Amino acid sequence: STGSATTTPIDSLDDAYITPVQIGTPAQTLNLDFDTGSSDLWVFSSETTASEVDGQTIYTPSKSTTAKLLSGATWSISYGDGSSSSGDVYTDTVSVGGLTVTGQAVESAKKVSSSFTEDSTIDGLLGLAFSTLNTVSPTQQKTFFDNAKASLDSPVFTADLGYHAPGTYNFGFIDTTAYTGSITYTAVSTKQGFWEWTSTGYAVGSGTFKSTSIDGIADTGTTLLYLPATVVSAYWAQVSGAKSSSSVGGYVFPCSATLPSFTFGVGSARIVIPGDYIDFGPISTGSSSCFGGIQSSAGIGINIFGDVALKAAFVVFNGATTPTLGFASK
Secondary structure: OOEEEEEEEOOOOOOOEEEEEEEOOOOEEEEEEEEOOOOOEEEOEOOOOHHHOOOOOOEOHHHOOOOEEEEEEEEEEEOOOOOEEEEEEEEEEEEEOOEEEEEEEEEEEEEEOHHHHOOOOOOEEEEOOOHHHOOOEOOOOOOHHHHHHHHOOOOEEEEEOOOOOOEEEEEOOOOOOOOOOOOEEEEOEOOOOOOEEEEEEEEEOOOOOEEEEEEEEEOOOOOOEEEOHHHHHHHHOOOOOOEEEOOOOEEEEEOOOOOOOEEEEEOOEEEEEOHHHHEEEEOOOOOOEEEEOEEEOOOOOOEEEOHHHHOOOEEEEEOOOOOEEEEEOO
């Protein structure tokens, strides 16, 4: 089997991407944030505290003839931006882009933090990291991809995120028309539950490539590119007027600037992030200070190749017995 679904930015800055997902019988379609950095499929639901729902589409298990309470199971998750959610669990039929999994754990939110409430466009998350991170207790549950894997034509999914445009998530096949040149594959460590890999270095603009190992994760659920302070300083030093602002919470730059590109290494291959991808616009409406898309990972504890990086590439998440990651230009 295979599946193919379009993923669409939630706003004009590509702050996140939503992908329609069919849950239950008859189908209830929710727009979920596919997140290769976590491993819970959770949704706004008929159980979510009413004051914490503000425009989201909700899953109502009592209206699904295939929904079953997973008795005794609960979940609770916190993310790197300090957001959180928690609740109980149903199993139900879940389809993405024509690919159907029966008996998928669908985690129903009883509580969500303010940032989720405040984002009316995201109806929940669909985790695509390794199932070892799944938070369901006392019986840990599998991700949609893990459940689907054995039925897929090939045990892979691909992320093809657009810059200010829709893109695609494919399951079970590699669309050889969706990228240019060849795909360079690189080793993955699953020790922390992530799609963790090591970039071979970076360049800023037309500058020389610096060979250096940068361990990080391929995370579709994180907006920006978070890298070591040394690397980030070298990038922003090429932008007149750019500075790190503790009050804003990162690097900002004059909105009048033309940003240089940023290149990262994948083995001997190179992925180029155009400068425009690194512009996240005014820090507040009408401001002439703009927020940077490359930020320091110091104090996160991990480097994160988020959407800013991933959207510059066609990315293969290879879930074979020894997982790997592939990157191609596009």
